[PDB]
Design a protein around this ligand. Structure first.
Ligand code: ZN
Length: 247
């Protein structure tokens, strides 16, 4: 895991201070962090950063893949975009804990070094979550305040998660879920991500949603729960998943 995640462009230097061989990660941001900067990320709370060990914790295959599609270079291009323009000074490995704290807080909480525009972060997240998904754009949209549960109003009332489901993108779903997407948020027709996974026959996405606490009994505007759709579409694999999840 640590060899695979550190092998990504720029992931062998800490995202925040460039400390070599970082063994920690933020799994919602998609970055590698050194002992000291990971310690500081823990200060921020789960809304900003979910800290994990590359060496000490288990990693789901999809999440390893997610890390490999983002990484320090991509995320710094977003979160440190205007550093060079602001003539401001990024901390090095040997810098004080306090200097690193002030940088990390300015970078992720204050959002101090972002560009002005990722004009519509929510809509952009929506567009970037759909086929073909752009994870760097999704990350950019999220940094600029995109609602992870953005509703496509006046239209179908779909969400970025529903878009990622239509795209059959495990990576985009995973990224949205890591960033707080409501696994149960339905469209105008009462169809949540699990409903869409089942309609489209995406067994892997259905499995993901069930693992993340998707509501098995949720009925759409046609009175169908996901099992009903799975039966009606003659999909033996999803039927089996759903019945097992019920037990
Ligand atoms: Zn660091």
């Amino acid at each position: 895991v640590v060899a695979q995640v550190q092998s990504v462009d720029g992931n062998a230097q800490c995202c925040d201070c460039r400390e070599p061989a970082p063994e920690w990660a933020s799994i919602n941001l998609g970055v590698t962090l050194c002992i000291q900067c990971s310690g500081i990320h823990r200060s921020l709370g789960v809304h900003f950063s979910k800290v994990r060990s590359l060496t000490l914790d288990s990693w789901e295959p999809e999440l390893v893949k997610l890390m490999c599609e983002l990484g320090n270079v991509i995320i710094n291009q977003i979160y440190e975009a205007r550093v060079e323009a602001m003539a401001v000074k990024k901390p090095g490995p040997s810098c004080s804990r306090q200097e690193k704290e002030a940088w990390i807080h300015a970078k992720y909480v204050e959002k101090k070094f972002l560009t002005k525009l990722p004009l519509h972060p929510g809509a952009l997240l929506f567009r970037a979550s759909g086929h073909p998904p752009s994870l760097p754009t999704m990350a950019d949209a999220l940094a600029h305040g995109a609602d992870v549960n953005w509703v496509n109003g006046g239209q179908d009332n779909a969400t970025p998660l529903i878009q990622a489901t239509a795209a059959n993108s495990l990576l985009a779903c995973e990224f949205l879920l890591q960033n707080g997407a409501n696994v149960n948020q339905a469209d105008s027709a009462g169809r949540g991500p699990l409903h869409h996974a089942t309609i489209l026959g995406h067994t892997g996405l259905a499995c993901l949603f069930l693992k993340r606490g998707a509501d098995l009994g949720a009925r759409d505007s046609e009175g169908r729960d996901p099992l009903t759709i799975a039966m009606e579409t003659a999909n033996a694999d999803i039927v089996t998943l759903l019945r097992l999840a019920k037990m």
